[PDB]
Write a protein that binds this DNA or RNA. Structure first.
Ligand SMILES: [Zn+2]
Ligand SMILES: [Zn+2]
Length: 55
RNA sequence: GGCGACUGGUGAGUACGCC
């Protein structure tokens, strides 16, 4: 919860974007330009996802 | 450490790159 929690990076962090460890989304090494990391469709984003809990 | 880039869908910045 605390910001200091991120200090876990000292022993590998948890990227809440890619999921990988060692780094954080804040600075993910994902060589991506722009894509929906919610569905997995490049060109758009989650905020612009087509399957966003919409019936 | 600094910077750059970025995204903020991003912990706030340094995992990357370099020295
Ligand atoms: Zn990542
Ligand atoms: Zn989508």
């Amino acid at each position: 919860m605390q910001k200091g929690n991120f200090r876990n990076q000292r022993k590998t962090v948890k990227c809440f974007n890619c999921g990988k460890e060692g780094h954080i989304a804040k600075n993910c090494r994902a060589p991506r330009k722009k894509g929906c990391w919610k569905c997995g469709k490049e060109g758009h984003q989650m905020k612009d996802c087509t399957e966003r809990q919409a019936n």
